[PDB]
Amino acid sequence: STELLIRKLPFQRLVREIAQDFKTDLRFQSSAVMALQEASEAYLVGLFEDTNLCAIHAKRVTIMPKDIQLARRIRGER
Amino acid sequence: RDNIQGITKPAIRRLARRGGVKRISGLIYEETRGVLKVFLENVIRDAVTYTEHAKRKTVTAMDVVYALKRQGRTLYGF
Amino acid sequence: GEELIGDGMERDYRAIPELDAYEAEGLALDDEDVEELTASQREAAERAMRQRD
């Protein structure tokens, strides 16, 4: 059940920082932070797959931000 | 507190490694950080809203699942 | 133009007990029963969130 992608302490402290922009006295469940972490890791791993293809299309091994932006644009994220 | 910098250069390589990525540009680190910030902001804002409507200050794992499904993501486990 | 596979890989996958677990701060102070959303609570939220221009 163990997965080392984003570290647990720096992830929590970022979720805690982002929630502060929206509301004070917010507490998270251990389960809630774990849900957002699996979600973020799954989104980014999946987007890294799609950006990888965009590079290959431009016939490159080295991934560039133009590939991240394309992948996101086709998904309808911009 | 700048906790986006907590999505370190090691963690970005580990996600790209898992993404099948062979090589990576330098500009990717600050690009990937931005893509995460935006996804986390949009998912947390929606989650915080469900917390508010259910008249509590505790973010549950299901407030995260409802926020994700609205933002087009479906996490298995719930 | 950085490379991702070869020497220095092992080092990226090291265990750091101190960072590999969640802090008490920020999390829920106690194991109290938490109110889960009804159909009304879910809809009134979903309606308001769409109505965000």
Residue numbers in the entry:
A (entry chain A): 57 to 134
B (entry chain B): 23 to 100
C (entry chain C): 69 to 121
From the paper:
MCM2 is positioned at the core of the replisome as a subunit of the replicative helicase MCM2–7 that unwinds DNA and separates the two strands of the double helix prior to the action of DNA polymerases. To gain further insights into the mechanisms involved in histone management during replication, we have solved the structure of the ternary complex between the histone-binding domain of MCM2 and the histones H3-H4. Free in solution, the MCM2 domain is mainly unfolded but, upon binding to histones, it wraps around the surface occupied by DNA in the nucleosome. The interaction with MCM2 induces a conformational change of helix αN of histone H3 and competes with the binding of H2B.
The complex reconstituted by mixing MCM2 (69–138) with full-length histones H3-H4 was crystallized and diffraction data were recorded at 2.9 Å resolution. One molecule of each protein H3, H4 and MCM2 is present in the asymmetric unit. After refinement, electron density is observed for residues S57 to R134 of histone H3, R23 to F100 of histone H4 and G69 to D121 of MCM2. The crystallographic symmetry reconstitutes a tetramer of histones H3-H4 which closely resembles that of the nucleosome structure (Cα RMSD of 1.12 Å) showing that the binding of MCM2 is compatible with the formation of the H3-H4 tetramer. The MCM2 fragment (69–121) wraps around the H3-H4 dimer complex and follows the position of DNA in the nucleosome so that it clearly competes with the binding of DNA. MCM2 residues G69-L97 and V102-R120 have extensive contacts with both histones H3 and H4 and adopt mainly an extended conformation interrupted by two helical segments: one helical turn involving residues M79-Y81 and a well-defined helix from residues A107 to R118. A network of polar and charged contacts are formed with the side-chains of three arginine residues of histone H4 (R35, R36 and R39) that establish close contacts with the DNA in the nucleosome. In particular, the Y81 side-chain docks exactly into the same position as Y53 in the αN helix of histone H3. Y90 docks into an apolar cavity at the interface between α1 and α2 helix of histone H3 while MCM2 chain wraps around the DNA binding region including histone H3 R63. The first part of this segment adopts an extended conformation and competes with DNA binding and the second part corresponds to a helix that docks on histone H4 in a more apolar groove.
